[PDB]
């Protein structure tokens, strides 16, 4: 899961 990147 990348979230905020």
């Amino acid at each position: 899961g990348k979230g905020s990147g």
Partner: antibody, heavy 119, light 109 residues
């Protein structure tokens, strides 16, 4: 569902200031909270985000250390570490949809609070 | 981000289209939101994900585009549409998210 900003006031340059966004009608831990500002006569400016649904945080590439963002259970805060006249603006917080994939859909906004930086 | 220069003019009942261009591709090709902004009022979300209309937003507002080129179209223009319009580019990194310069719409009544 409502957002209310508070903390705006007149501050001398260099004097730290913390703005607060208080939440009601929903839970922060199911969303993400975003800070945006607008200096007088200028455009909207994205500042940073703090997630509740996942545990993540980001500042705009240009922040470089000008802001701190943190949460409580019912608020999110924005600290302007060393305010300049460039930081004189109306500050808004907004709720976005969130997941592992990031955020989206800023469909809820507070009314804003005014920071005035002068000697 | 580069938007249609201000001001832009439209007659009541008329149709206006404003555009937004990003140097970089937005997230999943379509992370772009449109906001209405009036003085003394908070931003109001019109379109998210390039073409999806916000809850309770008039069907007079619509958006389209992909990658780096996007538009907002206002049809059946009302005086109530007199405002500045901002696009927001969302990217893989949140730190890159940016507003466009804003496009002021002047409504000719």
């Amino acid at each position: 569902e409502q957002l209310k900003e508070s903390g705006g006031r007149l501050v001398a340059p260099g004097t730290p200031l913390t703005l607060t966004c208080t939440v009601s009608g929903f839970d922060i831990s199911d969303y993400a909270m975003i800070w945006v500002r607008q200096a007088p006569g200028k455009g909207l400016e994205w500042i940073g985000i703090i997630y509740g649904v996942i545990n993540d945080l980001a500042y705009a590439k240009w922040a470089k250390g000008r802001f701190t963002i943190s949460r409580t259970s019912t608020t999110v805060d924005l600290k302007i570490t060393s305010p300049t006249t460039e930081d004189t603006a109306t500050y808004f917080c907004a709720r976005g949809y969130g997941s592992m994939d990031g955020y989206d859909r800023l469909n809820l906004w507070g009314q804003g609070t005014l920071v005035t930086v002068s000697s | 981000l580069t938007q249609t220069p201000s001001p832009v003019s439209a007659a009541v009942g008329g149709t206006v289209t404003i555009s937004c261009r990003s140097r970089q591709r937005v997230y999943l090709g379509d992370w772009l939101s449109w906001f209405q902004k009036k003085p003394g009022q908070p931003p109001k979300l019109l379109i998210y994900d390039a073409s999806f209309r916000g809850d309770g937003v008039s069907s007079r507002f619509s958006g389209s585009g992909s990658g780096t080129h996007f538009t907002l179209t206002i049809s059946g223009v009302q005086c109530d549409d007199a405002a500045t319009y901002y696009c927001l580019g969302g990217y893989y990194d949140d730190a890159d998210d940016t507003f466009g310069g804003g496009t002021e719409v002047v409504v000719k009544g």
